[model samples]
Target: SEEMNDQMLVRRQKLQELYDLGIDPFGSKFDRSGLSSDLKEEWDQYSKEELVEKEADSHVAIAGRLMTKRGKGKAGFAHVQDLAGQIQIYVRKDQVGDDEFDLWKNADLGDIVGVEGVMFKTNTGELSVKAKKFTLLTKSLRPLPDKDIEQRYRQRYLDLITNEDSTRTFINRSKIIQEMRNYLNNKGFLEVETPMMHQIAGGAAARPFVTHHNALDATLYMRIAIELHLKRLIVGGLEKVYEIGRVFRNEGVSTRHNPEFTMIELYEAYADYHDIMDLTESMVRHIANEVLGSAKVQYNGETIDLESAWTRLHIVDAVKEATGVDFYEVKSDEEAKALAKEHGIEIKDTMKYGHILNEFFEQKVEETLIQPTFIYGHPTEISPLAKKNPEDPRFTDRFELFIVGREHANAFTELNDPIDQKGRFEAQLVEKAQGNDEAHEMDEDYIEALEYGMPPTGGLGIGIDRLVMLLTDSPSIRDVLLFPYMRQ
Candidate 1:
């Protein structure tokens, strides 16, 4: 704790000096007539003389973090950054008096300050605020990292203050979420909330983060997916429901996967996976159009066209086309295993016929799907909650949407048959016993709810973080997230 450098010690000393002068280190709120964005949009077209005359008639008050500072003795200039963006502010001793000048002189790099100033252009013709009154709001104890990007991500406030693109990304993220709500609401989808903790971790095939409730003396699990609860709402006669909530999975961190991430799960009664597929395409295209102002979005230096019809292909057909192995004609697991071996594909000890087919698709064909695609007819072994096909018991009535060679959304025609659902859960339990920790758990209550009679429902889940990354053209999930989890 005593690793305080000279700069930090000087800042702390200033804090003490402010206390000696009977000033609060954290001051009360001040009124402001304008933010950085309002000033820019409203006054960017005016000339320097016109701006000076306009501001003289009407001064604007603004508060922000002092980002950059220059000038040695008294008359210096600095850029102040707010939530909207940054604006240049001029400070001088002779104009604002000596007390405020001393306050500015002692102010550190990240100090929060308020200014009542006239908007004008400097000699360089840059938009600036000529400070008439200056007040120190809060003194920043630590200096912002100017060069260490790794540390900037650790302290996200500094990243937001210093980086303009980061600011715009987060702002656009907010706009994306708002547009999603507007679209869903306009489509008559009822937004709902469900428990983040569950008695049984039965939603999807992902390991749940376990926790103990001391009050109930029971083991509970943080939800890995929002599907089960939203479906329960469907079972309860709430026809159309959606939840934009956080999901926790005990999984490894990567550019794609976060331990906790935001997901939007939608469930609709009397709809099938085909309906869900259409909804998925429309929803994503609509969100992109509204937020980014274009149906064609640029992501990772590649343009993704969302206005046209998204490609749809059966998983079996896609696998066959990619590797020239006719999995649909193969009847036995042994035959599938032989094909896998012949094609130099790896297999586990317990992989069955359907599992082998899925492994082929996942390993060989998935990365090639760069644009939007609906890969349907998922294997029943992998899709416990999805309904089985009528003629093809090996595949379920499920589809997973992929974009940019990554899985973006998943949807399925839900299995309403309670007996089949029970058998599926039993199969999952067998998988769990066979060292598959990410296997789904049996929810007896969900079974009981199905017995109470749920209508045929279609369910869909979209990763909000992934979608934001696409719209923002962010390369990593951390780029879209404000404070991604970091190991100490």
Candidate 2:
């Protein structure tokens, strides 16, 4: 730790020295002719033997942070890394002169610089830039994090050049997001923005991060979901709509969870849960192909074929399949409690039948769902916002997509009847009064919106970070996220 402190001090001093030289240590603007990816794509044509022998020069103006330094005195080589990739820079004392060469020697690893140079292959066959001129773009005052630490630093700029995997993940993440937007846009889905701070959080069952407004002197919670507000757009006659944004949860963080994460919530009027299921599968496959060039993706040593038809299983059936206990056969809460005891399942004294069934599913069934499967027809007690099934009134017409034993997407035939929605909200309030902090609060505004005759619609929410993790073969939610919330 003390060594890190000393390194940081040295970096700060170097920044001060640059400022003293009348260089804006954190410079304002720079333009680039091309990205490293573009250069790499054209490498074959540009680096042909005839072209290299003829000294057919092609100039590129690029900018990146210095990642490594090799030789020292007369001739030296350094690797300058950008977001796309790293390109070796050959620094010659004869070309740069003593003064400029000294400047290069003094440059720290984290400093950002722009260089105008000709691209060529070195004797070692590394693509390199022979700098004609250069300028210091930005001076980083803090020493970069060591490779052993978390790859993505809180300072994202430094992380971009230092971590190769992070750089690749970010590129893939961007492509996936763009592809999703393109798909929705082409499907006539209107993208909308909703309030980030809400008076009452009602979309999902999660605790909210709360804050106060100095002017109003009233408490506000950062929104835990965009479902309520986006549905209001559906009520306003936007037949197809979606919101791709951040949602904050005041809850525990883990490999599968985060305090703040990206969610893609969409609502399509006149569609039921079954229609949304088809849309969900198609959209995901399309995104995978667009980003990774194939629908077959790999994650953590497992190959998931997205092109395969997804299996559909009832939640109760999944539970029955895992354990010989048939949840549907248990008619009453007492019977469910008796069954749990018979099967050696742990159940809280106050747990209801629905809760017990969910616990059984989590313990025995969830991990077995390694492939793409839609677990449908959940108990009404666990699905407050979903419409009750026509055939089975005890279950709701909802489905949750599981991949790699993790919940990636949830969809439901939305309950649009005002009376039914209000009753569900009231039930949630009662649960809250009974000391359930994660219960959805009754939102009068959302109730009012539904009273305006909202059409029957299908709604879906996908955890974007989790999808990225699956597609990119990332191990944790933190791997896909740029700055995951961490405890101090």
Candidate 3:
């Protein structure tokens, strides 16, 4: 048996002691008329004399975790923290009588309590509640830890209780997500649900988490992207549809990646990547203005401007500018490979002209982009679902939104031609056989949906977690995630 520490042993005894005193110790129903911030807001402006005059009619009840305690004997002072913030309470034995005073005396710092009192201003002008009724609603058996980084991830509740910044970030995270829904809904976009489990994970190039269903005895893959099904809806005549849901990828955990994360995918018929680009710029700016009250944000000691028109540059041009090796002039696979070799850019032996171009962009130019930039004209070999540029058949009408040297969104004028889609799928099969396990698989059903004639649709996929991280100034993905995956 593990021996309990002094505080833990004492806390256990109090748990039993509370039971002996006919108190549940764990708690019951508490109806709070106000929050801790509410009391401050209503009375903080008033002088002590004015507060005293208003006390007769300003009775309020609040419930929260006891964050601090001080004073002694017949009376004490404590701060109770609600979701909004902390407010101090003055407890007098004469005010609450013997029983309630005893309950207050036994309360611990992490214990939750209900207080019904009249608003008062302390001699020092701190707004507080003067308790007429005090209650111990819930007893926290374990002592709260002071602080720990890994412990914060493992036990988020403790971090939330101790760190106000963590609580504020999570609160802002909720507001940010809600604002996204509001912006989309206001634009007449229909929010729709798509299945998380897929018969074939046919959207983006990513490894899927596989599972087996017992009854039908069939294997299923968790959806990697909301792309294919949402496109199917676009074909089914949902002119503007979007889905905000969890997408799973069998990937390594890092500062930028989680195995499971949120993504928002939207499609609008009769639009191209250019139109989607405008929509993206507008939506992100709108969300920033609404949630953060500014189009400019500070991240990791750098200021990023979101208000201005975002820079639009082709991927080939970006690579050329960075390394001075122009992919546009390089025609054949051999030429591209030769350029890659000369510049010390890494590339697989199986990589062709388009793949080598991409490698050059990623290795040389990707991280140099700090502000919002729509890097367009991705190669066709890498973008199976995107339509090809008519002028250059090798490149697709695709764009990836990058900020802080990380990709935030990927979008394209979807490849709606069934014939072209089939060919792309066939190309994907070749890549799969060539040891690129993350390549998109052939899905005849998705191709069949394209055959039924989906209109010229523009689609976008944004990583919501990374967006939150950027907006919140969080250094790691785990900071944004409430409970990021960790090895046991």
Candidate 4:
């Protein structure tokens, strides 16, 4: 172990020596015609004996990090790893002369190099290259993590070559997003942008990260959801519109949740909750088929059939089915609270009837929705942005899509009446006054947008990271994200 540490120290010192030898430790860019994947494809067509007999001039110029080296005084062999794969390069003192061979021997494991060589298979049947020329590309100053320490590999991620699964996950994440864009765009949806900072955060019931504008002398908050602004665009005549962007919430992080996350919010004119439900289900299935080439995906050891028909149910009935207690059957908030309390469900001291129903649903019904289900008609207390149901004023025209017992998407028919919207926002303001910082703030501009005679519309918000996790079978939010925030 001590010898290994000294070897690492010498590697770092050699990096400095390379700099003194008029070599740019971090070299400039170089270009080549092909990748490792291309070479593999070509090599696949040739027999092993044919590949070995191939002339050295059939070579191509390629660049990658030097991974391994083995040799002595005269000749050496090194492996170069690129994003596609790895290739072995054979170096000789006679062919490259004394100076170049010495540089090849001193090449650090983490250093990047560009090589031109002919492809061939060694006598041992390993595909390799006989180098005609090579150049030092980028000299890595720091030593890579010892492969033995798993924790150090995670901390010093660039030092470790990522596995195939991780590489596939990132590739699929990009493809999934691209498919979503194509699906929406093909359906005549207009992509739009919304402000990230707002004077009033009124889209959802979540604490917001607050900041100040010195020139404007005003307090501002990062947008908690894209719902409010995108709906305003619907009112502005961009009827079928969508926005996919980052939203910030001042909240704790978990395997399933993050403070800053990507979301896709869409609004369609003259549509309702039913329309959104169909759109959500179809879009999800289409994306799964397009991105993964299948409609069934396995997540957390469970197979989720995205092609299956989505189940729809009312919130109260679903809750009753799960817990055998219906809040609708109860006459008063006190009675509902008593039932929930008896079932060991905690509620706020000043909770209302709808809030009690929500608490009951969270405690009893949510986890049972393991398959794709659209649970609609949410309690008005929890769905402040939604329009009240015509039959029951206590409930709103809202639905949440649950998969694998977790909520991935929420949607509702928009509340276009300016007066009703103002009243709902005023109620949230009262909650804010009572020390609930997560409550929505009254937005005069949003109300003014409603006053411009906005058409009836349906809107939807999807947690993009959560959807990617479901499709990619990534168990943690960190796995789906490139750099998840951590408490330092």
> What TM-score does each of the candidates earn?
0.95, 0.90, 0.97, 0.94
- lDDT of the structure predicted as candidate 4: 0.84
Candidate 3, residue 144: how far the Cα is off, in Å: 0.6
Please report, as a residue range, the 10-residue window in candidate 2 with the lowest summed lDDT: 47-56
Off by over 4 Å in 4: 1-8, 19-22, 148-156, 253-255
Candidate 3 ranges beyond 4 A from true positions: 1-4
Clashes of 3: 0
Model 2 pairs whose backbones collide? none
lDDT of 1 by residue, 349-410 (tens): 78898888988998999999988999999988899999999998889999999899989999
* Overall local distance difference test of candidate 3: 0.90
Best by lDDT: 3
Candidate 2 residue-wise lDDT, 1-488, digit = tens: 89888988988888777766666778778888777776666663555354466444567788888878787677777777776777777777777676666566668777787777667786656677777666678777676666425445455655665567777897899999999999999999999899999998779899899999999999999999999998899889999999999999988756567788899999999999999999999999999988889988987787898988999999998988888888878899999988888877887776788878888888788988988999998887788899999998889999999999989999999999889988988887777777778987878888898998899999999999989999999988877877776656
How far residue 445's Cα lies from its native spot in candidate 4, in Å, is: 1.4
Report the number of the highest-TM-score candidate: 3
Tens digit of per-residue lDDT, candidate 4, span 210-320: 999999899998999888888888878988999889999987666567789999999999999899999999999999998888889888888898888989998899988
- The pairs that clash in candidate 3 are none
